[PDB]
Amino acid sequence: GVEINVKCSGSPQCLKPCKDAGMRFGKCMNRKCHCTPK
């Protein structure tokens, strides 16, 4: 489960939370975020 509960809208809104997380690539969800670690 590499996802984090974050309020996202569109793909780039989740790109921001993952930016500070130091990871790359991600996705979105009705009320959740998706992050992909190396």
Swiss-Prot record:
Coiled coil: none annotated. It is found in: Secreted. GO terms for molecular function: ion channel inhibitor activity; potassium channel regulator activity; toxin activity. Its main location: secreted. The keyword Disulfide bond applies. Pfam families: Toxin_2 (PF00451). Expressed by the venom gland. It comes from the Eukaryota. Negative results: shows weak inhibition of large conductance calcium-activated potassium channels (KCa1.1/KCNMA1) (Ki=1560 nM). Shows weak or no inhibition on Kv1.2/KCNA2. Shows no effect on Kv1.5/KCNA5 and Kv3.1/KCNC1. Belongs to the short scorpion toxin superfamily. Potassium channel inhibitor family. Alpha-KTx 03 subfamily. This is Potassium channel toxin alpha-KTx 3.1. It comes from Androctonus mauritanicus mauritanicus.
